Amino acid sequence: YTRVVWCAVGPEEQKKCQQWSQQSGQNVTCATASTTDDCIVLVLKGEADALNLDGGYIYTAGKCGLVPVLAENRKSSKHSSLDCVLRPTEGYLAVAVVKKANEGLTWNSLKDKKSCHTAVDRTAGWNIPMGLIVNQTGSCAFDEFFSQSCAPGADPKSRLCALCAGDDQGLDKCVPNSKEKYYGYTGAFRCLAEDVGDVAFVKNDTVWENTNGESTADWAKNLKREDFRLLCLDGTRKPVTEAQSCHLAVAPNHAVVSRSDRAAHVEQVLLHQQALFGKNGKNCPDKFCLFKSETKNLLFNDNTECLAKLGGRPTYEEYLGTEYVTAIANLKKCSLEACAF
């Protein structure tokens, strides 16, 4: 079989894919979709082979029979003796971020405030925060909790999209892909950084990667970590240096998924691909690097050291975990066991 078709979401991920396709020598070809849900459909249809997904979407794909193949793994302090591919995933931290100057704003005073979400149906951006709020609220009206928000994937005409900007020409407002100015980790964080929303639901690495001259992007140039705070669940506020003791949850790393009858073939190709384009790959710094897309997190997160093997050949429920799976199920009874398509 040996040739893999990768599904790219949006035009920016497509242009990076073609570059990968080129350097691969047609080993990897691209398919494009305007949304992640459409990419899943393409993989079900068999028109695309695989794609890297956020846990939230892995639940969706899971109910449709797709399976996790390899997970993203970042550089850690613990487990240095083991190589990156055989090394277990540690998972990222879901947090709630705010401006320091915005005093008196805690977890208990979020109602009727403005929010910034990575996108609808995602772990740190939607599922974790909204699940918690639904519980504490005892109501399914999460569309009324915040006054205005930017949550890519929601109804454009609703308040949940009100804070989203769209692209260069203000078109595609609220679309769930990088054309939306406030889409994803970097998008949601910029949303807070520019003071559009009062809070942003991203992950811990995002704050660090886009502050203290790490990003070099016009909007991130002058951001200082000291100007930001994390909202803990006990109603306290802490510096971004205390994420381990002030997070909403710990999430399962983004993973590459595919149809179970293609997983073996997809896995084989990818390992060979990162041997060439990975962190220390033969052709990375020189020709092309798979895990670099100038802080835009295209196809993969920029902090990915390598895609790691799973081990225990886990199902999508085992990969996500029982904890998280019951959270999504509970949150979903608001908006019954079948593939959404």
Ligand X SMILES: *[C@@H]1O[C@H](CO)[C@@H](O[C@@H]2O[C@H](CO)[C@@H](O)[C@H](O)[C@H]2NC(C)=O)[C@H](O)[C@H]1NC(C)=O
Ligand Y SMILES: *[C@@H]1O[C@H](CO)[C@@H](O[C@@H]2O[C@H](CO)[C@@H](O[C@@H]3O[C@H](CO[C@@H]4O[C@H](CO)[C@@H](O)[C@H](O)[C@@H]4O)[C@@H](O[C@H]4O[C@H](CO)[C@@H](O)[C@H](O)[C@@H]4O)[C@H](O)[C@@H]3O)[C@H](O)[C@H]2NC(C)=O)[C@H](O)[C@H]1NC(C)=O
Which positions touch Fe ion (CB under 5 A)? 54, 123
Q: Which residues pair with 228 in a beta bridge?
A: 99
Contacted entry of Zn ion, ligand X, ligand Y, none for residue 301, CB cut-off 5 to 8 Å set by kind: none
Q: Which helix (H) or strand (E) holds 93?
A: strand 92-99
- Is 333 within 8 Å of 131 (Cβ atoms)? no
Q: 300-339: which residues touch Zn ion (CB under 5 A)?
A: 314, 318
C-alpha to C-alpha distance for 54 and 43, rounded to whole angstroms: 16
Main-chain phi, psi angles of 179, to 5 degrees? -70, -30
Determine, following the binding rule CB under 6 A, whether residue 27 of this chain makes contact with ligand X: yes
Stretch that binds ligand PXB, among 37-45, 75-83, 262-270, 318-326 (CB under 6 A): 318-326
Q: 246-275: which residues touch ligand Y (CB under 6 A)?
A: none
Determine, following the binding rule CB under 6 A, whether residue 29 of this chain makes contact with ligand X: no
Determine, following the binding rule CB under 6 A, whether residue 197 of this chain makes contact with ligand PXB: no
- Is 119 within 8 Å of 151 (Cβ atoms)? yes
Binding mask 274-313 for ligand X (x = CB under 6 A): --x-------------------------------------
Burial readout 222-250 (b: 16 or more C-beta within 10 A, e: otherwise): ebebeebbbbbeeeebeebeebeebbbbb
Q: What residues have CB less than 8 Å from 243, skipping those under 6 apart?
A: 93, 95, 204, 230
Is 122 annotated in a binding site? The answer is yes
Determine, following the binding rule CB under 6 A, whether residue 318 of this chain makes contact with ligand PXB: yes
Determine, following the binding rule CB under 6 A, whether residue 131 of this chain makes contact with ligand Y: yes
Q: Which residues are annotated as a binding site?
A: 54, 92, 118, 122, 124-125, 185, 254
Q: Which residues bind ligand PXB (CB under 6 A)?
A: 89, 252-253, 312, 314, 318-321
By CB under 6 A, name the binding residues for ligand Y.
128, 131-132, 135, 323, 326-327, 330
